[PDB]
C-alpha cells in the first residue's frame, strides 16, 4: 500500500600482498575493497588480477551484504516528475 522498494548489493573484497621485507617474503594487509554485485571468491579474484597487474594479491574472502533502500509512495510522489 504505502511502501516502496530499491535492492543495492555489494561484495567487500578483503585482499592481501606478498612483498619483500628484510630480504623474505611476507604478508602486507592491504585495505578491503568493495564493488557493485555479488561477486564469488573467484569473481573477485578475477578482478583483481584485471586491478592490479602481475602483482602478488590474493583475494582471502569476499562478503556480500544487500541493503534495500525503500521510500512510502507519498514521499516518492513529493519530489518525482510526472513525465
Known sequence: ????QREI???TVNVA??????????????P???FVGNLTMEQA????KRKYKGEPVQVVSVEPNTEVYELPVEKFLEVATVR
Open 9 to 11: 548489493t555489494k561484495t
Open 32 to 34: 578491503s575493497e568493495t
Open 1 to 4: 500500500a504505502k511502501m516502496m
Open 17 to 30: 600482498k606478498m612483498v619483500m621485507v628484510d630480504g623474505e617474503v611476507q604478508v602486507e594487509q592491504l
Open 45 to 48: 579474484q578475477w578482478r583483481m
